[PDB]
Curated annotation (Swiss-Prot):
Span of domain Peptidase S1: 1-236
From-to range in the entire protein, with total length: 388 to 624 of 625
Glycosylation sites: 63, 104
Organism whose genome encodes this protein: Homo sapiens
Positions annotated as active site in the UniProt record: 44 (charge relay system), 93 (charge relay system), 188 (charge relay system)
Record protein name field: Coagulation factor XIa light chain
Effect of mutating residue 16 to M: In FA11D; dominant-negative mutation that results in severely decreased protein secretion
Length: 237
C-alpha cells in the first residue's frame, strides 16, 4: 500500500494474509473472508502454484511478526480459479480458496458482505484499500497492515488512463488523478472495502496497475459485483 498508514488491530477483520511455504514461508497475497470456509482473492496470485498444500491462510493478523512456526492457520483444501481467467490485465482475476477447516468468527476475524446487483448504481461513500504490499516500487512486504482511502473512478475515466488496455465493466479502478495513494506489489488479492450506508462491502479485489501510485494511473480491481453469480455457483456444494 502506497501513501497509507498503519491499520488499527481488528479494523479490517475480513482481511487475511495468504502465505506460501515454498521454498521458505513468506507472504504471497491478500484475501477476504466471505464465508466460514471461503476466502476470495486474485487468480493471478497462484502463478506457479501446483498444489494448495503449500498454502497457508492467516486471519485476524495485524503484524506479520505475529506469524511464527507455532501460529495457527487455515489449510487450503482447494483453489478455484475462474475458468475464463488468463491474466490479471485481461480480467476474470478472481479465485476462491476453500479452507480445510471453518473459521470461527470473532471481532478479529469475520466475513465481509458481498455487494448486491442492486448496488451498481450506489455511489460508494468511502472506499479503503488494504494490505501488506509494497509501499513503493521495489520494496518489501510491510510488517503492519496498511490502509489508504482511495476514491473510485469511472470506467470511462480509467480507460483514458490505460490506452493499450481494455478496461471492461468487470473491472473497476480507484485512485487519485495526482497519484500518491494506491495498492502495490503484495496487496494483490486484497479487498477494496467500500462503506455502503455504515455497512462494509467487498467492492473490488486488488488486481493490477502500471507501477504504483503514479499520476494518472489508477489501481485496477476486479469488479466483484459482476461475479456474485459465479461465487454462489462455486461455493454451493
Amino acid at each position: 500500500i502506497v501513501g497509507g498508514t498503519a491499520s488499527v488491530r481488528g479494523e479490517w477483520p475480513w482481511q487475511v494474509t495468504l502465505h506460501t511455504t515454498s521454498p521458505t514461508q513468506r507472504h504471497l497475497c491478500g484475501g477476504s473472508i466471505i464465508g466460514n470456509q471461503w476466502i476470495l482473492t486474485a487468480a493471478h496470485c497462484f502463478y506457479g502454484v501446483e498444489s494448495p498444500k503449500i498454502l497457508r491462510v492467516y486471519s485476524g493478523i495485524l503484524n506479520q511478526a505475529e506469524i511464527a512456526e507455532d501460529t495457527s492457520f487455515f489449510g487450503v483444501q482447494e483453489i478455484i480459479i475462474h475458468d475464463q481467467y488468463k491474466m490479471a490485465e485481461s480480467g476474470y482475476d478472481i479465485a476462491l480458496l476453500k479452507l480445510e477447516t471453518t473459521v470461527n468468527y470473532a471481532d478479529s476475524q469475520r466475513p465481509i458482505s458481498l455487494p448486491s446487483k442492486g448496488d451498481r448504481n450506489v455511489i460508494y461513500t468511502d472506499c479503503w484499500v488494504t494490505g501488506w504490499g509494497y509501499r513503493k516500487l521495489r520494496d518489501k512486504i510491510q510488517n503492519t497492515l496498511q490502509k489508504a482511502k482511495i476514491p473510485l473512478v469511472t470506467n470511462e475515466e480509467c480507460q483514458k488512463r490505460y490506452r493499450g488496455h481494455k478496461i471492461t465493466h468487470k473491472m473497476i479502478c480507484a485512485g487519485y488523478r495526482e497519484g500518491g495513494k494506491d495498492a502495490c506489489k503484495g496487496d494483490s488479492g486484497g479487498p477494496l472495502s467500500c462503506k455502503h450506508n455504515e455497512v462494509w462491502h467487498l467492492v473490488g479485489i486488488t488486481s493490477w496497475g502500471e507501477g504504483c501510485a503514479q499520476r494518472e494511473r489508477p489501481g485496477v480491481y476486479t469488479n466483484v459485483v459482476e461475479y456474485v453469480d459465479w461465487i454462489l455457483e462455486k461455493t454451493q456444494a
